[PDB]
Symmetry: T
Subunit: 150 residues, 12 copies
Amino acid sequence: ADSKAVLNQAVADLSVAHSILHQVHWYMRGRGFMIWHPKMDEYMEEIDGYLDEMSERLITLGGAPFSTLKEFSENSQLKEVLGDYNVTIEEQLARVVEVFRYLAALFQKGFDVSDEEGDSVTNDIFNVAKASIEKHIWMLQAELGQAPKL
Amino acid sequence: SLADSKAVLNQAVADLSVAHSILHQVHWYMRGRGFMIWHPKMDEYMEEIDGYLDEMSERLITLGGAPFSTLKEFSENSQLKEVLGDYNVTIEEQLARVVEVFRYLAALFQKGFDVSDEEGDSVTNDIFNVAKASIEKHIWMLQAELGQAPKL
Amino acid sequence: LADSKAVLNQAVADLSVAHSILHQVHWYMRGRGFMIWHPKMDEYMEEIDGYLDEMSERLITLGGAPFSTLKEFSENSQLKEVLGDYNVTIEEQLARVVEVFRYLAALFQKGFDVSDEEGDSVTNDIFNVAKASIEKHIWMLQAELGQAPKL
Amino acid sequence: LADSKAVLNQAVADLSVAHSILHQVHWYMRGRGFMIWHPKMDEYMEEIDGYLDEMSERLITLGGAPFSTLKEFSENSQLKEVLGDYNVTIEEQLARVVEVFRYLAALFQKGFDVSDEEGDSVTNDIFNVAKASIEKHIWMLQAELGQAPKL
Amino acid sequence: LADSKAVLNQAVADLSVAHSILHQVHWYMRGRGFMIWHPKMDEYMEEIDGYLDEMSERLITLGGAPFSTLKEFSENSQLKEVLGDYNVTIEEQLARVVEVFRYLAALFQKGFDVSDEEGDSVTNDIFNVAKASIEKHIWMLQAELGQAPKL
Amino acid sequence: DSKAVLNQAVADLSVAHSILHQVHWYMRGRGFMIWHPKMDEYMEEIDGYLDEMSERLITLGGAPFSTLKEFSENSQLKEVLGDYNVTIEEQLARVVEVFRYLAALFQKGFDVSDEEGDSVTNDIFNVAKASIEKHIWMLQAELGQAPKL
Amino acid sequence: SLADSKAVLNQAVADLSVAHSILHQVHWYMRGRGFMIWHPKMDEYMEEIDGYLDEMSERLITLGGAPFSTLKEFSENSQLKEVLGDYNVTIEEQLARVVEVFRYLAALFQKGFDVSDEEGDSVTNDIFNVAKASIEKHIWMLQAELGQAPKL
Amino acid sequence: LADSKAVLNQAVADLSVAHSILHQVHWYMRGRGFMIWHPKMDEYMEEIDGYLDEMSERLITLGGAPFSTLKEFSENSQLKEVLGDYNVTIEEQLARVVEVFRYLAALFQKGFDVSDEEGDSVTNDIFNVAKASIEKHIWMLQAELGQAPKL
Amino acid sequence: SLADSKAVLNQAVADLSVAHSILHQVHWYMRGRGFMIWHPKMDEYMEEIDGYLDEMSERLITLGGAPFSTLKEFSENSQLKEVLGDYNVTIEEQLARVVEVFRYLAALFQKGFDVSDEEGDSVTNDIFNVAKASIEKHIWMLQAELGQAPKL
Amino acid sequence: LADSKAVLNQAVADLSVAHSILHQVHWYMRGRGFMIWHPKMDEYMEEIDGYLDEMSERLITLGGAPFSTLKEFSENSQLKEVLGDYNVTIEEQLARVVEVFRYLAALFQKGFDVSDEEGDSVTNDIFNVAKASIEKHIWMLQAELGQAPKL
Amino acid sequence: LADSKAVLNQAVADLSVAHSILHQVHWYMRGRGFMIWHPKMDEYMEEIDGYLDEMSERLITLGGAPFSTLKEFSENSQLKEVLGDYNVTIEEQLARVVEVFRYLAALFQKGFDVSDEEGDSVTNDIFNVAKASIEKHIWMLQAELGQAPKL
Amino acid sequence: LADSKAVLNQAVADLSVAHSILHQVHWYMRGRGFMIWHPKMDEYMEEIDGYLDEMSERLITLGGAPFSTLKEFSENSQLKEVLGDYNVTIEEQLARVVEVFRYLAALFQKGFDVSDEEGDSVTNDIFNVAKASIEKHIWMLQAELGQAPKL
Ligand SMILES: [Ca+2]
Ligand SMILES: [Ca+2]
Ligand SMILES: [Ca+2]
Ligand SMILES: [Ca+2]
Ligand SMILES: [Ca+2]
Ligand SMILES: [Ca+2]
Ligand SMILES: [Cl-]
Ligand SMILES: [Cl-]
Ligand SMILES: [Cl-]
Ligand SMILES: [Cl-]
Ligand SMILES: [Mn+3]
Ligand SMILES: [Mn+3]
Ligand SMILES: [Mn+3]
Ligand SMILES: [Mn+3]
Ligand SMILES: [Mn+3]
Ligand SMILES: [Mn+3]
Ligand SMILES: [Mn+3]
Ligand SMILES: [Mn+3]
Ligand SMILES: [Mn+3]
Ligand SMILES: [Mn+3]
Ligand SMILES: [Mn+3]
Ligand SMILES: [Mn+3]
């Protein structure tokens, strides 16, 4: 019930995160494009993997997942802007960092709610996902010359 | 300058984003005999759709353009309509819905071919031809499962 | 670790019988849908086999003695076997696989509880991973039958 | 080895026609089950092609001359072809394949008997292996259609 | 799109006969070069089969009805078949394959033109891709025979 | 007849699977690291015969054993409680013994089907017998012995 | 009859041979930050360029032609100029030079598209189109690295 | 061991030392069983290296600073090394690995409780997976030595 | 019971060993048009000969016998004759010599087949049958290269 | 050619022209044996390309500057090129490849000697590996032509 | 370092330290280029481990006793280790790697010199193959840093 | 080059006999360790065959005429063969594999010495690579037997 609600929140937020990553992939310009351009692709595939798992788990529990663009946009707490080629590489990576931080926090909130309802399966899905998102936070901040700062 | 080629590629970026969301809905809310075949089949169709989306968008970037890249833009520029998920829709109704989405994409890809042909954009022209070919083969197979002719 | 051991061993028995019923369904299946559901019971049996061996080997690791005869499998399992019957419909055969899975999922839930109480987190992970996967199977089976997972 | 050579050539003709009938079912199929049975037709086609080549090549190896034109396939085969038709039901299409397979299985048995008598053990095994796998498909096809194999 | 449907169906028949001829060459080959040219006939067969399925399924897609019996293939095809013969030389065998390929390339060109006039751009592409590859083979086969391609 | 001996094998193959699994689990002594996963390859091959033999019986119009009750009651092999104290040598000699029984059973399967003219079934028993016999050679060799077929 | 198609195929054989030598130089003489990405990337470009050369040369043979097949022939017929290897060229400059060659190649493939179209040689037409497609996509990526639009 | 950052760093030092001990055994082994156990020490070293990298990287992600010099590994580790000796027997070599593994399973449990108390669930899972596998290796190692695992 | 089956198995151990040695000679001393197809082909033949050698020997061990295992036992028990290698033999004659070795082996495998069928050794019977099937097929192809019928 | 660097650079230029000559043989080839020797030219070219890249990168590693224009390749190489000609027989084409391989083998021996004299042992091994496989190829090529290697 | 056995063992010591230093660079790396050079360090580490195992095993094979404790590695190596530091630039990190690799190249020259002198040709090769690839990495690293390799 | 040629052909003869001796060990083996040492004999036979093939072809490439009959192998080889005996223990069989390998490593050293004196550096390299891996196998076989390599 609370588990079901935090899973459906992730469905919406992950759908918007994929969209933002695709924008970064497409509009990227400046030194470093050749390594970071295909890298967004690895990220998008990971994000799709979570989206699928969390949504299907919600179905499995008796819920009804968001499944239209209007529902993703309106329920998600991530905000989107028009694509723009002039944004710098380093500005682009900082933005991925801020999306990833929000997802880490969402997944913690997911861990907590599922733990207090005893839904162990859902609990595990959130923990695995938070684990790899935080490793990516380490790597992105290191590219930018910074500590991870979780 | 390729004004209309660019424009139909962007129309295709929006339309493919919405088509993808509609196949995901079908994939999730599917119930009834034939689930075990058609549930994973939707995975294949989404992957194919994602391929065209990426290729058509990158061709647009390649020509000097600016692809749609936010959910708001996809949804306001697409000619496809979304309704709320519902588990009570039959299998046959689900497949007929995919046929309609595919019939639309095929005619969109046809408009894409004609427009690029006329502007001398052979590369773009070929992307639209390859995509149409495959969407039309799917329409044959889906129609067949439903005991019908392709009626292209 | 007396009760983690007890339930690990219970699983060895129920999973042996669960494997036998899946095999029956695989052999005696008749009706529209056979060609997709026949090889699908193969995938289920292989996954049941994986659990059988991992739970058993965890029980040895903890210093116990796993059930290892058809006799022990029979008298300890709470699953009930009947004679093979070709005249059972496809839908009824899938409903039967649903029952067996629902039972296994409940078992793995107990196993999870007792391991968590006794401080055995290795065995706790084992039970959780296997529950996740069987519950995904129950959704898909019930969807084929036009129904909700109803967990 | 006169009757072994003659029976291999018969198979070359009948397998060529069986191939063509399967191709027709693949193309003209409509209705529920299309998505599983349409590609399944390709698997049978590939399997049929393998027998065709083994049997033909064995006939060559023994100093024979295989049928190698469409006219020869048509006039020497005991199988009958009809015009393609999109209106036939899936269930009718599958029973048509059971029929072709029933004929091939019996032909392969004549193959086995005639070569056992003449002591051509190599040709004997070729027909045995092929009969084994064709009877297995008759079970599965009939099981889909709600029936016993009735070999 | 009346003419596109007809030349697709013509190709179905002619490809079917081309297959049979390639297979006769494969089987009846003798002389220096056998070891290289016998397996090569397999590759051309796999490629001719690819054309046949792609073109037939395009016709179904457009609302047509493919030829699907040996009888229809023989009667509609323009290629003549003859009885198999071991005494034919390697040079003669390869020359015959060249003749068949020249024919198919001329048919694919006509197919290209008709579909172009009618606006069927997908059929246009199938015919073009197939023409490219057959032409390339004619070059290699002619080169083996000591000749320019002479398209 | 052929149907009767196919069903017998279904039964005996199910108990022999259970016995290999026992050896696999309870094994202790020098040679564990090689023989423990070797029992895995044996069970796989045993599972292969089982599935092929049941399916042939279905194909012939038969009705295969499909309960632990039926396997255990129809098999001529006997099971005992698992014991950690058995020796590596004693464990391999049990396997040898189960394999000798299977080779004789497959023999009967060959003779019976051959006399009935069911050649497909005849070949199934022949292939299975060949491989089990090869296994008896190797196991026996590990234990310092001739195959003594 | 097909004399202009032949002559443009052979022109490409000369130009591609020289383009392969220029990529090799860049590969070898490269120095500066980003070397570890861009050095192996020249290898991928070299394999692509080798694929077109061999395909366009064999199509010329298939048509009745006689391809250029000596360094002297390649050098005298190519419109590309070569200079001496120099380690002191910067990374930006090397990447800029590859863009120059890629732009020339894309325009030559376009001319090849045109000529084969006017002669009725649809097979040769296709070979140029497929090659143009992928060279233009590379011009997009390289210019992105350099902070620029594709400017096709 | 104050917190999660502390026990991870401890794991870094102990895994570096355990790797070196396993390499010693790999190199100096002698006696019946060499051909099996010599390569099996590579599998262990690789598994060890795996955990080393996971834990080290989690400590960095968390804002820490892993030990990265031999002196640091040597001084902080609780395991003790001795000069390589060819006159150690196979069985003694195996028992030393068991000793090293038993220490590691204990360090992993400590890391489990400490992370569990802090709410650091990610570090909790990393220590749980590592313990699961180490303990399985102790069952097998002991079984070769004629003993129960005795965890 | 199984003395004769056991005797023919070992006969084959010797013959397969000499046959292997003869193929290695042909492979080494081969000169002439076709070298580049037939030199590697000899390796495929050697690997197939080794396959029968190991299988037939192991079947013998399995039945309680004792396989020949010395070049002396091989060379005295074999019915095949060897001669010094010669570079001046033609391609067509090396291939004809291979043919003769194969003809002998197939006759032997028929003797093996007959002997084993009479003693009710159904396993040994199958091994000989399978080896005969493949060797006879090579005979067809080799004779086809040389412009002849198989003439089994 | 007075040092290791000068012979590497000599090799860069000679390998580039050797590549060009092999490409010409590949393209202008006609006659019996085309089908085996046309794609063999490909394997020869890929191997030549590996030597080129390796010897050039060795030069850079030693502080040199490899030739890197067609002008520089053409002027520094002792190999001569002629216009392509379809009327050259197949056996004549193979003889030309032998001729180029005999030259390359001689160059590599000079490279071996020079580098050995200077203690450039890494360079020395590069020339040795390359000589070995070229010489093997001369053996096979001459064997196709009914001749001893005559190295 | 008077003989082959002693320089091999010095190699065992320095290669263990090399590995520890590369691992540091891997972990403490920060700045533009992190995403390419972080994984590259793993490639170097893996290649160092290979040289370790080969050089160590050769020593054993000749009848010596490899250093096998962190103590022995650290005392016998000529390489210095400092504490981990996130605030080093990418250019400074790759500069440290170069210096380490130059040292290793020079050692392998000593191993080569000493083994040639003693006529142990096997050990000679191992040092030669390892010198080859380390030198190649130096060129690439120096190129990234805008420099000639300056061996 | 006469002596290089002479020792290549001696190797041809010795490697043929070694291959014969290993197959015997493989076949006649009985006792604890059979299951690991029986397949290990296949790996050694394969590596032997590779050496045999390389050394014979190098001889052919040099102008030579390798031994190619069983009689030539038997009478030129310094290895002696004895009748197969199932009673030899596992430890005796491995000791017999050791003696064969000791002879081969020594034969390869004189191959190395002779080709070095004649300046045949390709032949020199082949003997060196072979000696390296054989001597590695002596270490491993002596370890199983609880001994030092004692080269
Ligand atoms: Ca001619
Ligand atoms: Ca013109
Ligand atoms: Ca003839
Ligand atoms: Ca001439
Ligand atoms: Ca001659
Ligand atoms: Ca600083
Ligand atoms: Cl529900
Ligand atoms: Cl910071
Ligand atoms: Cl004993
Ligand atoms: Cl720069
Ligand atoms: Mn999904
Ligand atoms: Mn993309
Ligand atoms: Mn297990
Ligand atoms: Mn064939
Ligand atoms: Mn098809
Ligand atoms: Mn089955
Ligand atoms: Mn080519
Ligand atoms: Mn790492
Ligand atoms: Mn063997
Ligand atoms: Mn390179
Ligand atoms: Mn090692
Ligand atoms: Mn060879």
